[PDB]
């Protein structure tokens, strides 16, 4: 299923994911696509920073859900 990841520059990244994917595995997909090391990525959905060992389904991330991404400086 597709999800979108928006940055603070207005850029949106589309990812192909499954609800059982771990947050760590979504960070790897973002690194593959945008070059950002997983350790510099902070993901947000619904008022929460997303934790690496949890899944997209734990956060009710569904088809065409939009996450945000902030980078560690």
């Amino acid at each position: 299923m597709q999800i979108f990841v928006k940055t603070l520059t207005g850029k949106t990244i589309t990812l192909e994911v499954e609800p059982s994917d771990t947050i760590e595995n979504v960070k790897a997909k973002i690194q593959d696509k945008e070059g950002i090391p997983p350790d510099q990525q902070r993901l947000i959905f619904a008022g929460k920073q997303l934790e690496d060992g949890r899944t997209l389904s734990d956060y009710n991330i569904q088809k065409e859900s939009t996450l945000h991404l902030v980078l560690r400086l």
Partner: protein, 55 residues
Amino acid sequence: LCKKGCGYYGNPAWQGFCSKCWREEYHKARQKQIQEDWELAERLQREEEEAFASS
């Protein structure tokens, strides 16, 4: 009957809304969640800017 009162029949799989009122409700809820997430992200960015500055 659609619980928004548009006159169409509601679908129990759509929480009692008809198709059109359900899609409106879905879009509005995602728009609000996406705006609040953006505000949180700007707050996290400011926190990153402070920590980075402090070193």
